[PDB]
Each structure stands twice: as structure tokens, then as C-alpha cells.
Amino acid sequence: MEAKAVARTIRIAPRKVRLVLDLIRGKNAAEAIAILKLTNKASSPVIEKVLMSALANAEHNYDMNTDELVVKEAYANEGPTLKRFRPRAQGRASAINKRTSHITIVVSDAK
Amino acid sequence: AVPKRRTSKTRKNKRRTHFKISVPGMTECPNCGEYKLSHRVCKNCGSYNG
Amino acid sequence: MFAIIETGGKQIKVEEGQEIFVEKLDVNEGDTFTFDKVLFVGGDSVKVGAPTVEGATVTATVNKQGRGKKITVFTYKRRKNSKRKKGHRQPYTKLTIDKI
Amino acid sequence: PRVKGGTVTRARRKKTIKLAKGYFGSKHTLYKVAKQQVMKSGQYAFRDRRQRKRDFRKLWITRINAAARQHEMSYSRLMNGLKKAGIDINRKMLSEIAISDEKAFAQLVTKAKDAL
Amino acid sequence: RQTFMANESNIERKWYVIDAEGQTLGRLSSEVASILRGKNKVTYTPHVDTGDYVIVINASKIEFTGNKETDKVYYRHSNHPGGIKSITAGELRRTNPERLIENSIKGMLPSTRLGEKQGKKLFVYGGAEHPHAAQQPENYELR
Amino acid sequence: KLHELKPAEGSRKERNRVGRGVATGNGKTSGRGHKGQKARSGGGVRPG
RNA sequence: ACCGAUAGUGAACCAGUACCGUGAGGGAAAGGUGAAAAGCACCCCGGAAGGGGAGUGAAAUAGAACCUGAAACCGUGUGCUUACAAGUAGUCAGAGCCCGUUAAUGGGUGAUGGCGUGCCUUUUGUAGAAUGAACCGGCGAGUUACGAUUUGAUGCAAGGUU
RNA sequence: UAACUUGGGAGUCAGAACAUGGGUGAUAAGGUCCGUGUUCGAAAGGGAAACAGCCCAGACCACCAGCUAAGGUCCCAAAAU
RNA sequence: GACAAUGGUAGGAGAGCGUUCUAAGGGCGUUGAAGCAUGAUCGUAAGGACAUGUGGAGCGCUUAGAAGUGAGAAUGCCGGUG
Secondary structure, three states, rough: EEEEEEEEEEOOOHHHHHHHHHOOOOOOOHHHHHHHOOOOOOHHHHHHHHOOOOOOOOOOOOOOOOOEEEEEEEOOOOOOOEEEEEEEEOOEEEEEEOOOEEEEEEEEEOO | OOOOOOOHHHHHHHHHHHOOOOOOEEEEEOOOEEEEEOOOOOOOOOOOOO | OOEEEEHHHHHHHEEEOOOOEEOOOOOOOOOEEOOOEEOOOEEOOOOOOOOOOOOOEEEEEEEEEEOOOEEEEEEEEOOEEEEEEEEOEEEEEEEEEEOO | OOOOOOOOHHHHHHHHHOOOOOOHHHHHHHHHHHHHHHHHHHHHHHHHHHHHHHHOHHHHHHHHHHHHHHHOOOHHHHHHHHHHOOOOOHHHHHHHHHHHHHHHHHHHHHHHHHOO | OOOOOOOOOOOOOOOOEEOOOOEEEEEHHHHHHOOOOOOOOOOOOOOOOOOOOOEEEEHHOOOOOOOOOOOOEEEEEOOOOEEEEEEEEHHHHOOOOOHHHHHHHHHHOOOOOOOHHHHEEEEEOOOOOOOOOOOOOOOOOOO | OOOOOOOOOOOOOOOOOOOOOOOOOOOOOOOOOOOEEEOOOOOOOOOO
């Protein structure tokens, strides 16, 4: 049995999030909570929450002790983007993208 | 100068072979019992204990 | 004991109980055919000669009439609006050799 | 009545993409590029059917020459003897008769030599 | 479709020794390039290699016909502008006789991924001896 | 019988629509050849 | 024998409006939860947003960014293969290794050999270093009214027809 | 085995090289302008290393089948060291 | 059954497939229609079927009739994503 957790429409761009997800994909619960707390990247204070709340469904809905858990699925998907503009030189404009992502973590007891 | 040809999904994914961040390289503290950065203080409670 | 028959404008090496595919004959399925032109009888048996051995017929039973795998014949000429497309299935007959 | 195109354009742009699977990169994904490669593939196949009957003949002739050289006689000399002897066995059978059996082949080399 | 092809499992290979004493450079090279390629055995199998290892001995004794020892130049380039070098076939043989024979035979094998692997079966040594006694190399006589 | 009707034989023919592909015989140029005054729209010459 | 949300009025959606111009003036985009709001009480993680359960309902992968949900494009896992090689990237020949179909000379992958200079326009002649196309999806070009002349068909016939 | 006659519908009016008779140029030019053939244009396949026009030859489709053309037979590369 | 024929641009002639709608007949559909997805299937071609999912209310077949009747290319128009 596996418990999942999602954070829909976070405002960090998706291929900035993906740099962190790699470092934790396959590690252990207590090791994963520590890596996301000693890294200097900006997507750490958000990804950590999505992981600290997958472990609250792994024990309150089902019944698993939170010591022997591994991280099985960790990916970031795309979300709807925002259109913006920034005026350039000599009466011309250029577009901007405010990108968004969905983050997802699944923790399991290897059974 | 401008690009003459488009770039394929293959040539784009080889360039990023090396675009990855490394492990922070941490150790457990012999008080807190919690992972801390090497040669720094334990944030959870500060005890360097040189 | 192998022999060299001459059936469909081609030659075929034949052994007892071998399954061989040839060009469409008129014989019905479940019947028994015969080959009247044998070129070479050899191997374990006596080496013989040519143009054709005397007597020496080979017998077989017909298993199925059919149609081979489909192919597609496409061609074109560039910068000239000219293409063409055709299909084709070549028919066949499957036999099994039982007396050389 | 107004007749808009529906499901008739999609239905024949997928008959062309399925015929191109295993192709590298974008040649199995985009229609404009997979349609040119499906066209060229058919032209090559038509040419390659004809050359398959040339390639295999220059394979049976090398094998037969290498079998005949053992008995101190060239492929050209042996072939000329067989025609006089009226044996009439095509290049494919002689190669198989030689690879499978050495003894039967000798019984031919000898006859050609007798014919001269 | 009764044709027989040969695979790695069914292929064996022999070892031979050819002597270059009193032999023309181009009359010996041609015959050795038909052994390495395997055109003397009935199972030719063009996709697969079936050739035999050959060992040249006494490669200094190789002989050229007519005014060549001073009228045949071997040229090379080093990719730097103006760097093009040359050496006369006489001096090459009094200097490095293994190279002479070995660069004439290889200009007769095809230039593909498979002709590169058939050029590694050629061993060339000037001395009347050879270090490959561990196999059983039988002699082959050029016709 | 209003559900099996057939006209006389030999009478109706189907009209010809030009410019609908290469395998019809009336494709790219639609039966006009190449550049000229009889290939532009609006036509070429007076009745005289 | 008219359209069905790029169609039909510019306009099925508070449109001659948001906006653009000193002014005359121009001018868009935007429909659909369910039969019925019965629009998720309470519990847990979090500052919240957002989730995981429990419930409503025939259906929540019907949760108001609401029917269905294609392609480009972005990811996660995995069965065969690749670090001495000169490639319009396919096509014919072919071992090895992994699966079992609308059951028939089956399907996937591909060490190694042979042949091999994209498509369309315009030209005496284009791989062309001549033109055009970033890719995907929708829309986008011999028609109708009246006259004339020739073929096929049908009716009557020194008559035929309004 | 084609011809002519009356009616319906057309396209074409920028041509190129090679051989052989001649102008013009300089018994120069893949120059140019005429006469006379063929091939390209609108023609794939084999040879000339690659090479629209040169030598051979005109593809209805299928084949791990035979005899030939130009050109060829020491190795690359099929057939005479 | 016998023999002969069957390369093709501009162009002329003949036979066909599919799309939306209508008339008449005859049918399938909550015991799951169209459409969307996957498949190793049948025709000389354009193309037609049958199983399995996803969906949830309409749609084919036979014979005629009428057309806003088929898209890869216009530095085409509009939306989306590189």
C-alpha cells in the first residue's frame, strides 16, 4: 500500500523543480527530510511540505510506522502558464512566461 | 549570430548531461542526532563542540 | 536421400517429410501429386546423371492452396506530378514429400 | 448544405504514421516528415527486389569457384564442361550439393573433365 | 529459399605461414588478401568473417621489378599547412620492412568496419623466426 | 417504385471538377498550361 | 434537401463594447457540471493555497480552470541495443536475445555486409550555395443567373411548341 | 498497317548537347546562326571512377531461375595470374 | 482458350472511392449510439469491416437526387506548444 500527496499549481517553473526531485528519488524518509533542509535551492521549502504531508496520510489513513518508508515516485508536471509582456527598445514588445508546476510524491513500505 | 538549424530532442538532452547539483555532503551531529552540515553549527540546537 | 526436382521454372532440393512451397498448381487440396522431372538422385543413394534420370518419379500430397504475404508497389518521379500505387499477393501451393 | 471536413483528414494521416514506426527521431512523429520517408521507402523496395536476384547469384558463383579450385579446375572451365555434358543443374543447386555433400560434387567434376 | 549462411558458432579458422623470400611485393600481396578474406572456403558468408590468420616471414627479402628502389615515393600528410613528407621505397625496406608489406596488403581489403577487423590477422616479421609457436601454424605455398 | 428508380441508360453523366488533386488529370494548373494571358483569371481575348 | 460557436449578423457570452486614435474613424475576444445543488458535515498535514480519507450521486478520472478530451510538446518507469566510429539516416540480406496474435511462410529489438546526394515551384538543365515552409490542429481557390453552338437521352413527326 | 474528310476539346511560339555539311569569329569559346540525323526535354536499368544530352537498351506485377548486349576477367569487385 | 499490346510532362477520353444533406423501403441502439484509442485483418487503388477498452444518445445499410464535396506548400489568416 502506498500513500500519495500532490501540490497543484505551485509557481516555481517545472524544470527548476526537477533539479531537486532527483536528489531524493530513491532515498529514505528521514534522509529525504534532511536533504531538503540543508540544500540552498529555492524549491526546497515547498517540496518539503509535500513530503511532510505524504507521511501524514501514510499513518493516519492507513497504518504504517514512518521509519521504514522509501520514496518511490517523485515527479513534477506542467501547469497552466501566465502571459506577460516587457517593452523593449524602439517601440517593440516581447512576451514573458510565468510558468507553473504540479508536484507529486508517493511513499511506500516495499510490499 | 542566429541559429541556422533547429535543435533536436536528442542533441538538447546530451548537453544537460552535466547540469545537475551535487549532494550537500552532511553528517550526523553527536548531540542533536540530526543531520547537520559539516564544519557548521547544528541549527536545531547550536553546539559546535570543536 | 535427396533429389533435385524441377517444378515451376525453378529447381527444389527435396527430402522425405520436408515442407516445400511452389507455384500454384491445379491439383485440389487433399489430393496427391507427382513430379515427372527429376534431375539428380544422390547423397546416400547412387549418384546419377542428366539431362533427366529414367523413371524416378517423386510423389507428394497437397496440403493447402493460398496467397502469399501482401506487398505494395509504389513508385514516383520527383518534380513531376506522377505517382502510382499497386498491391499484389502471389498464390502458392504447399506439399509434403513422402517418397523419393 | 455546408460540408465541413471532419474525421476524414485525421483518418488518413494516421494510416501514414503507423507505416513509419522504428524511424529515428521526428520521422515517426510528424506527418510532413513521415510522409516523405514513407514515399522513399517504397521506391527503394522496388529497386531492392530487382537487385536481390543479382546479389545472390554472385554468391553462388563464388562458392562454386572455391569448391572447384580444390580439384585444379577453374569455375569457367567447369561450367563449360557441364554444358557439353548436358547436366543442366542451375548455380543454386550446385552450391547446396557441394556444401552438404563432397562426394556427389566429385562425381560431377569428373564428368566435366571427361567431357573436356 | 534453400541457402546456407555461416554464423560465429559454426566458423573455425586455421593458421598459416607465408615466406616472402624472392617474391614480388604485388604478386605476394594479392594472394594473401584472398586468404584473410576467406574466398577459398565454400561457406563465404559475406556478412561474417571466415578468414585465416597468416604469418609473413623474411619480409626484408621482398623484391621490386625495374627501377623502383629509387623511383617510387610514399607520401603522407600531417594536417599542418605545408607538412607533406615522403620516403623512397628503397630506404623504407632498409629501415622498416614490416611496414612496407603491411601497407600494400591493406590497400586491397575493403574500407569498412569489417575490413578493419580482417587487417588484424596479418602478422609481419623480418626475421626467419616468429613468436607464434603456441598455435600450430602449417605452411601454405603460393601458387 | 420510389425506392428502386433508374434513369434511361446513356443519359446522365457526372460533371468534372478541376483542381482536386493530381490523379484526376486536371490538377495543379487545371487545364491551362503555364504563364500567359489565357492562364490568368479574367480571360484572354475578345470574341474577335 | 439554410448555419450549428474559426460557422451564422461585427455581436447566441451586459458588443458597436475592452481597447487604439487630437479628431473624423476603426473593433475584438468569451457558449455546455447534474434528472435534481443533492455545490463535499466531520477527521488529519499546512500560515494558507492545495491535498489524503469519510460522505452526496447512476458516475467526482462529473468538484464551478466543471460533457467528450485528438496532435504538437513536457515527464516517470521499463524489454532488446550503443563509448575505434565518416552517417538524406532508409531498404534488401542476417545471427543473437526477449514476447505469444483479428493464428499465418507470427510480433519486438538489430552485431555485420550490399545499394543509396529530401519535398514543392520555376527552368535548356536544380543534391543544389535558386524560391517557399519552426512544428501541430482548424479555416482557405472554375461557381451561379441569363443567351449561343455541338454531343447523349426521351416525346411527336411535314410538322413541332407555347 | 496505315491514310484522307467533316465536326468537339486542346497544349506549344525561352529549347540543349553530340556527330556530319556551311556562314560569322581568330581553320578561338560548354560562343552563335542556318541545313540533316539521334538522344534529353517527357526515360528508369547496365558501362564511361563520380557525370540530363556520350556507347548498349525502352520498366504491366511477383521469383535466393536460365541465355545474351555495351563493357570486361591480379586484389578492392562477379568471370582467364 | 489462342495471339498481340500495357515508360511517360503539357494536354484529350473512360471507369470508380469517400464526405454533408433529402426521398422511399428496410433495420440496429442504455443487454451501451456517434466519436476517441490500440491491434499481427480484407480489397488492383482511393478505401471497408470485426474484437477490446474509454464514453453516454443517437446512427448506419439498399436505390435514386442535390452540392459551401476532399489541403503539405500562397514570406496564407487565427489558436496552441517548442
